[PDB]
Amino acid sequence: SLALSLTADQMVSALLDAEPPILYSESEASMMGLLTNLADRELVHMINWAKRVPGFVDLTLHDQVHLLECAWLEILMIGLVWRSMEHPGKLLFAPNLLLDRNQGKCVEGMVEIFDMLLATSSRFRMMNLQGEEFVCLKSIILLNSGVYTFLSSTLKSLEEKDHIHRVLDKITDTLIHLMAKAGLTLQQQHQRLAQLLLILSHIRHMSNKGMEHLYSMKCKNVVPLYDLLLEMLDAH
């Protein structure tokens, strides 16, 4: 039970050291091939990362597989939104792949999602989101997205959920702590906390639209045979 003993500062630190490496990247089909090739490679590193997320390895394998399947696109979006944050009007998929909004028009229905992503990036920028807050939010996403979509028929399954909600509580304390160090009023803290968790709600939305878009692109036969990405996609 390492997870629940970690202090605020130990949680933040531990999350900053699990951060995956930033990858470089290598018509409608080619744009989709470009984005899904990046996504597929990051998935490999997102798995290594999830294992380093406190309390994650404590779950059953079937539940680890469940949380990553539910949250993965949400996790690629929040990371994309975060690193685009200093790049107004631009999406920084990779250090060698900085995409304009108008570059979304290469793919049917994609510019819409780019708009949603850039608006989220602007919100994070206007709020002056900190990196320490970002890593907290991404771990919340991993832990909370599939917690409600678990086999609620087993006592063991009911213990998994309870453990996940004790850990998520920790992360809330961690976020509160970070906001106090930043010298926020108690009022300003819980306001900021809610403003951020409410953004996870738009991110779940963006992810639902992007999942629809990718399944639709796969049906057009314009998605290459990236085995791990299709594995995630086909869990819906």
């Binding site: 798995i47 990553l68 791990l228 995630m232």
Partner: peptide, 9 residues
């Protein structure tokens, strides 16, 4: 079944 399954184990 699995790649996810294998990288998590």
């Amino acid at each position: 079944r699995x790649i996810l399954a294998r990288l998590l184990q």
